[PDB]
Amino acid sequence: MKYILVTGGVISGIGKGIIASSIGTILKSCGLRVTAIKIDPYINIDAGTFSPYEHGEVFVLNDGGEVDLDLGNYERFLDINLYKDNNITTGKIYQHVINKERRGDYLGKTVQVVPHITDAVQEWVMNQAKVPVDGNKEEPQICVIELGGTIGDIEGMPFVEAFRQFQFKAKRENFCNIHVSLVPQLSATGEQKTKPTQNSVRALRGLGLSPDLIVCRSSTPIEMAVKEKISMFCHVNPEQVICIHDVSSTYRVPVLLEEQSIVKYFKERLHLPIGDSASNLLFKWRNMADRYERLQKICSIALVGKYTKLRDCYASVFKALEHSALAINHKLNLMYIDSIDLEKITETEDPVKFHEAWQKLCKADGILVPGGFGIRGTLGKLQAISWARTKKIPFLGVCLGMQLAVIEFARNCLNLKDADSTEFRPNAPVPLVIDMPEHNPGNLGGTMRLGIRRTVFKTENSILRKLYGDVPFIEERHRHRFEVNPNLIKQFEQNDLSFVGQDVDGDRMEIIELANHPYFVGVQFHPEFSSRPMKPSPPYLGLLLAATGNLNAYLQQGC
Amino acid sequence: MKYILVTGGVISGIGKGIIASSIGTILKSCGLRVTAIKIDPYINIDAGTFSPYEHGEVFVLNDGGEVDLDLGNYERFLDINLYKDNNITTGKIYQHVINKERRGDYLGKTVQVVPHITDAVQEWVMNQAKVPVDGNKEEPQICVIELGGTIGDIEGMPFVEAFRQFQFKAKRENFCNIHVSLVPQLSATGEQKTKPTQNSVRALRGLGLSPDLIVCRSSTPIEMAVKEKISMFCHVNPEQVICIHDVSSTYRVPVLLEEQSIVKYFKERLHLPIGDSASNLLFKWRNMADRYERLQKICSIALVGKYTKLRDCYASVFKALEHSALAINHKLNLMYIDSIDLEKITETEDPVKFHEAWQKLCKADGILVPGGFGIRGTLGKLQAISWARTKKIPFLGVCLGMQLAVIEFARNCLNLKDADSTEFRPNAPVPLVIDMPEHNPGNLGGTMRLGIRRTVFKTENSILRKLYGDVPFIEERHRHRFEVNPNLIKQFEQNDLSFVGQDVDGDRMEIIELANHPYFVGVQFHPEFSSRPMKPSPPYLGLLLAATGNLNAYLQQGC
Amino acid sequence: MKYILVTGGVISGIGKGIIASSIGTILKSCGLRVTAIKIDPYINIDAGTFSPYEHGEVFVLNDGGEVDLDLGNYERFLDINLYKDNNITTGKIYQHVINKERRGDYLGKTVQVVPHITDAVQEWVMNQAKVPVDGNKEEPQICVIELGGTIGDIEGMPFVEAFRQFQFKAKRENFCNIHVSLVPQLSATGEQKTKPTQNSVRALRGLGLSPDLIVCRSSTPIEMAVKEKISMFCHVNPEQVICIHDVSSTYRVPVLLEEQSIVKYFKERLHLPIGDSASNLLFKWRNMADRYERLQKICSIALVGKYTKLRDCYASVFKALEHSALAINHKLNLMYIDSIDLEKITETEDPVKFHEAWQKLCKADGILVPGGFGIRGTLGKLQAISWARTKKIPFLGVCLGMQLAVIEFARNCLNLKDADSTEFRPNAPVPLVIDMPEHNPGNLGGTMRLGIRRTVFKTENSILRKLYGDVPFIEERHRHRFEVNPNLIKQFEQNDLSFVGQDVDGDRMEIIELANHPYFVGVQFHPEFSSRPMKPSPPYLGLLLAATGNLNAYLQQGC
Ligand SMILES: Nc1ncnc2c1ncn2[C@@H]1O[C@H](COP(=O)(O)OP(=O)(O)OP(=O)(O)O)[C@@H](O)[C@H]1O
Ligand SMILES: Nc1ncnc2c1ncn2[C@@H]1O[C@H](COP(=O)(O)OP(=O)(O)OP(=O)(O)O)[C@@H](O)[C@H]1O
Ligand SMILES: Nc1ncnc2c1ncn2[C@@H]1O[C@H](COP(=O)(O)OP(=O)(O)OP(=O)(O)O)[C@@H](O)[C@H]1O
Numbered sequence A, B, C: 001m002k003y004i005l006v007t008g009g010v011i012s013g014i015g016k017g018i019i020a021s022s023i024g025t026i027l028k029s030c031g032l033r034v035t036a037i038k039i040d041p042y043i044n045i046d047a048g049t050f051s052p053y054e055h056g057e058v059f060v061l062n063d064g065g066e067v068d069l070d071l072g073n074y075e076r077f078l079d080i081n082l083y084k085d086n087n088i089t090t091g092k093i094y095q096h097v098i099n100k101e102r103r104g105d106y107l108g109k110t111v112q113v114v115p116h117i118t119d120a121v122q123e124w125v126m127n128q129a130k131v132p133v134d135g136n137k138e139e140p141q142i143c144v145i146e147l148g149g150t151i152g153d154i155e156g157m158p159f160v161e162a163f164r165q166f167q168f169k170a171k172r173e174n175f176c177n178i179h180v181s182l183v184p185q186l187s188a189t190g191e192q193k194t195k196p197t198q199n200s201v202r203a204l205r206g207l208g209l210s211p212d213l214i215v216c217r218s219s220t221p222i223e224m225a226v227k228e229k230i231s232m233f234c235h236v237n238p239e240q241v242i243c244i245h246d247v248s249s250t251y252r253v254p255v256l257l258e259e260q261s262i263v264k265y266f267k268e269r270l271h272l273p274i275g276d277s278a279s280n281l282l283f284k285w286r287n288m289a290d291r292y293e294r295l296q297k298i299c300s301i302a303l304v305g306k307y308t309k310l311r312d313c314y315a316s317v318f319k320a321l322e323h324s325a326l327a328i329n330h331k332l333n334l335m336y337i338d339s340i341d342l343e344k345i346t347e348t349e350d351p352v353k354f355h356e357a358w359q360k361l362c363k364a365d366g367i368l369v370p371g372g373f374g375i376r377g378t379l380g381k382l383q384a385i386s387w388a389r390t391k392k393i394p395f396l397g398v399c400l401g402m403q404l405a406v407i408e409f410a411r412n413c414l415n416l417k418d419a420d421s422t423e424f425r426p427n428a429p430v431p432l433v434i435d436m437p438e439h440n441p442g443n444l445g446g447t448m449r450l451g452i453r454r455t456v457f458k459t460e461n462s463i464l465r466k467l468y469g470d471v472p473f474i475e476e477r478h479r480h481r482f483e484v485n486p487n488l489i490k491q492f493e494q495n496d497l498s499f500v501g502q503d504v505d506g507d508r509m510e511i512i513e514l515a516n517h518p519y520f521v522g523v524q525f526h527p528e529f530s531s532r533p534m535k536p537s538p539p540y541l542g543l544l545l546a547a548t549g550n551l552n553a554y555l556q557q558g559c
């Protein structure tokens, strides 16, 4: 099978996944079945126990994933839905190997990093490329492999040697190599240097891998004097240096590689079956490049998270939002509001950060309350829903807001201020939200609810049901532990806030809507992990429709 | 002797010399005698045969230097004038060693890179620190050593091993180590990475040198989360991480190190004699920081060079100009004008680049024609002086303009269009500018005129004589081969353009002034290499005085 | 042209030249024209100023060589005589490059180690392979390139990068790579390790060269478990691991590579024109393997040198001696005798080292006095010739003995004890040996006599003339400064010791013979540098013939 191994340049946050997916999604437009394998040097297995401020938010797979992210980017760009066993971490390999030397399966031979780890790496990447990953039941023909991390450090040492042996066991027509480096320029002056790319190549070539292409991502487009120096010093012909500058939206990244002629390259390098057309599909990639230049009324949410500045804790939501903004031809203005900045305590001690949050939340044409944990933010977010409740600005609750909207509603309408979730204080006189993890055969003890779960819409008066297409059940994914008590439904069996969804059996509800409001939805499932640039997320699409008021206008068409 | 060895971070053009001079010129304000030794890994000996577009302009020393530059920066910041034997290049060492193994002075032993080169390096740096360099006849006490180049490449291999052996032969109280790295951030996003600094340390520590300080120069000032990661990963305490952002003028660079408390550091590290005052001299460094923020009428030259965009071919002039702009409280607006863009040929084929040059030269309140060679630019620059001649905008000719102004004047006034310099065409019917290199005892053949040369002012009616202080002779330096024929003076023994200067004997003139003009000077010597931020260059100071019209107002004071 | 680049393993003294010549001299038996280029990382140019105890004796070429040695080994094994410009040292390159940047031939561009040195290396190796080197006037087809030194150190850094760029500029069919490593075993125990070969490969592959073959030279022949580990860890198939153990004579080294089938390898790798016969010439390499096992009367010299233990100061003579011992079917017993151990002074202070020298010199069936310099040994060697003079044991004087034999003869027969050479004391009342270097046009001052020089035999009664084949002139090479005065011949115009040779003009004599003696020869030329395993050196061949007494028996055949 043809394999493409991208790597890393000087710094980690270049845009590794934006290149590996782009050369993947060009080849998906070529008519090739694609997989993706992300090699990760971080020891930690099963990323789900991260605080999301170090790396980013989780992604969630079908079979129970808690996989990093970058993995999410591949899923969103390629139409692929994945499995959890191609997030191949260093802790995944060692737990696969330390659990074999107690079995004795290496026949008493002492196992060392070479070859008995690097044999287990080049068996892992053979099997995950072999399994189909898309709607067809058929093995693919390429496999874009992302060696994450940087290169030269101690973490990346068992892996580049694992692929050095792999160039020999594979054929040279079956292997490729991309190197995505940085040419940093100092705005302080004006020249543009090529030295960081030279030392990053001789750390790659010094470990026994040679770049086919070399991709120099920087701030500005680079001059032909720079393409000459990288061609002469890094010992590759000038047809393999591909510039990519900092573009405004990531949809320019696939069509910018079309101009630099990488499509016909892998015809000659990899010897893959291709004939040439318009080198991507003209209707669905060059179109939405022009949608992002020519824009309109800057509108359509404020966001209440619980973090400081856009570390990608919420980058997996912002790519889902501008999917919907791609549909309604609006520029989107994502503005973070810290839930600390809505507390009583900040106004007492600092009004510069507090009054700064309200200013944006009162002018907000839409709120969004995504998921979170812990006591931070929760007491601040309790006022944000009720502000949206009375003054009727639409919002969506995701995995925490659905908990918090049912808390505030009994406090306001039913005057039951004593009620709260059992997340925080177990001494609950009215335990309105109870813990109940899935007690399944094959799952011992308390196991977090995870994976694809069917949930059926009960009754017709849902604005969500018309958005998915009036199908009875939807198929979504979530990672949360807590539910409103089905006994505690008795408290709200008459109001305007009634529960809509039910799963296969019916022991939880997962979905709320409110009558006397434009658009009041709160869901337990994360509706971000199926959002694609072609069809947006159906809760998020209506949420921007409610912000522009065209939500009734979308259902005038129907039909 | 206490030695400070700065190095290099990721890319070459960080600001190595701006840090090594700054920690030098803090210690000069401490009351310590300073030298400077710049280690250069480039094989080429005696930089003077450079095209000035690869590296920059030359510097010229007293004894006959053709030394790079960075060396010039030390000279200008420290009051030091240097010798040519501390520009210690790789070609200087090998020519010092290959000329010893024919002598047999290694006693028949085969010489290899270690130790017999690295012995010759640590004897070179011992001797150049030992020689006095300033007005006192006394050995200094520190020696700021600049290991130029970057680190990790093949050129820098004989030198870091040369200083690894040097930490043992010296005492730990006598040695220091600075590392000036880059933390590149991508404006494309917003985070700030620390990885390039980590790999640059483990290439330095992997060659056997440990940083005392670590200096992270970048675009923006960096947050305490970045100072924590560099302290924890690069294994130095957080008192040795010093931030320096891209500041507007280089005079902030000494006073910004004062805020980060590096003055008291070397009291504890190097054990040098110091008591504390205001940590620099309050009148002459923090004052001119405020001169550059608060500014005035944006005026005071256009420049006609012969190059494209400000590669530092003329950075050794621009630092001399804003010395004078530091004196007259004016912002300076250096605008390059290519001499190609004044030719007849560009207007025929492209008026976008041609008309763009004139636009700036007609609004120019002052022209400047610095030195150059070859047929490029010369035919273009012939119109620039005559444009300044008739319409009377002041300019200065430096080492080529003095040739070109005497050419145009016989063509215009004396109608001798046949005359030209013997630089370009030897078939000269009127050879107005003749070749005559110095034929000296000890100098065989044609040797370029070079070094400090006395030149005496003949007569009183010079506007230059009042600027230097009415001394009879001035002491300047130049590197040029050509002179107007002393026989050809007969052509101009009556006009308004008469020759002013004479050297010790009188076989050349070196200096012109024109009567019916505000300020018309052309000099063979380079008046850039003595310009300091305290007293500017005396031709360049009057040139900005003529631009603002206060040139008469400067001599109203006198006295 | 097909190029083979051998390298180095862990330690320097493996046997680099014994492998590179052997794969050369197999291909010479294949019917291919061969050159040789030895890359040397030692800075010193023109090895001739060595003390011969660091590296070894010199070799002397035709055009004036003072080249190391290993070069001598190629000459002796291949029938090739060389030029001095393929001893390409590091000091040869830099003196070729520092003498070009004063010319300006790099067009003002700053030259660095990459590429402008490595361009000059891959132009040097192109030209020396291009020039013919053998009796034909035709370019060869292979070029065995010896990258001397080891690999990984600082000296070998400009060269392995110089050949990494060379694999791309050449074609993969035109390039090869040998790696000659050590597998050290400890007699202390018994196992045999493969670790030093693994780390030596990943320092070679880490610099961008891959071994075609891998040659493991050690003490014992190695087991198939060792060939499996080197095949699996060093990532080459088990057909390219070639064992070679410590063999008794170096003539087994070509025929041992025949058994391991490297002849058919380069047919497949290099794509060179070959058909197969007996894979070497059966009459002249496998024959003299059996000559060295089956041997005879252990006889046939003691040697008086001036050194301690057989550092190869005299290895260029011992290979010439066992050429003659290959002809007379005798085992040779080379025993060193220090000339210190024949002095008066050692017997006074130590008789353990003194009496140990005489014991071997009185039982000596032949003496040999090779070349040397300085006051050490000279006063000791004066008794060794007179011991050979009276008691009539044959010897040969080489470049110093010819001086010393003419000194002792006037002291003994003519009773002129006052006479001595002008090498040591210039106050000579009878200056019997005078200095006269060649004063040639194109050679300024005192230049050492060097290169091929014709010398004609005057008269018939020479035992040397019958050995060369009664040709009038012979063609030999030497490096010496001193001659007997042609005026001082008047002292010996009647004795039994008369001068035999004369060059083209006749101002020196170069050759002595004595009548009343079996074999008394002393020559100024070095007769070691033409000795080949087929025909021995004609003075050295008769010297072993005089030791066995068959010297008359050789001339009974004639004819
Ligand atoms: N072409 C681009 N131009 C500007 N910004 C980009 C581009 N590609 C990606 N980015 C932004 O930079 C960040 C880094 O990109 P990406 O997540 O693909 O790298 P990654 O290798 O997956 O990260 P990690 O190494 O943490 O897994 C992303 O959050 C994205 O928003
Ligand atoms: N603190 C600073 N902020 C912004 N720009 C700077 C600073 N210091 C220096 N520069 C600019 O960047 C350039 C590089 O500085 P400098 O010449 O000191 O480096 P260098 O090591 O001497 O260069 P080279 O390695 O070529 O000798 C200079 O031309 C200068 O104008
Ligand atoms: N196959 C062999 N077995 C045993 N000894 C050998 C063998 N080949 C060479 N030697 C001996 O070991 C010494 C080293 O061999 P050789 O001179 O070929 O190495 P070299 O690389 O030329 O040395 P240098 O690196 O100093 O030039 C020689 O003096 C020779 O006598």
Ligand SMILES: O=c1ccn([C@@H]2O[C@H](COP(=O)(O)OP(=O)(O)OP(=O)(O)O)[C@@H](O)[C@H]2O)c(=O)[nH]1
Pocket (backbone or CB within 6 Å): A011, A012, A013, A040, A041, A042, A043, A055, A070, A148, A149, A150, A155, B192, B193, B194, B195, B229
């Ligand atoms: O996609 C990736 C790739 C790599 N990594 C992991 O990040 C590490 C490299 O991390 P960085 O290079 O980003 O540096 P750092 O985390 O130490 O500090 P910052 O610069 O982020 O402020 C690697 O050790 C790798 O395990 C990720 O977390 N995500």
Ligand SMILES: O=c1ccn([C@@H]2O[C@H](COP(=O)(O)OP(=O)(O)OP(=O)(O)O)[C@@H](O)[C@H]2O)c(=O)[nH]1
Pocket (backbone or CB within 6 Å): A192, A193, A194, A195, A229, B011, B012, B013, B040, B041, B042, B043, B055, B070, B148, B149, B150, B155, C110, C112
């Ligand atoms: O002050 C210095 C320092 C170093 N150098 C020399 O510059 C080389 C490093 O040069 P660079 O790191 O700047 O890269 P480059 O010249 O190959 O191409 P650009 O990035 O400039 O476009 C080093 O090999 C060193 O010899 C200088 O010229 N001046």
Ligand SMILES: O=c1ccn([C@@H]2O[C@H](COP(=O)(O)OP(=O)(O)OP(=O)(O)O)[C@@H](O)[C@H]2O)c(=O)[nH]1
Pocket (backbone or CB within 6 Å): B110, B112, C011, C012, C013, C040, C041, C042, C043, C055, C070, C148, C149, C150, C155
């Ligand atoms: O054939 C050669 C090869 C290499 N060399 C030169 O020898 C050096 C390697 O020398 P060694 O590896 O032999 O170590 P050393 O000389 O320092 O000390 P000993 O082990 O000999 O006792 C290299 O730096 C190279 O320049 C030779 O002299 N002759």
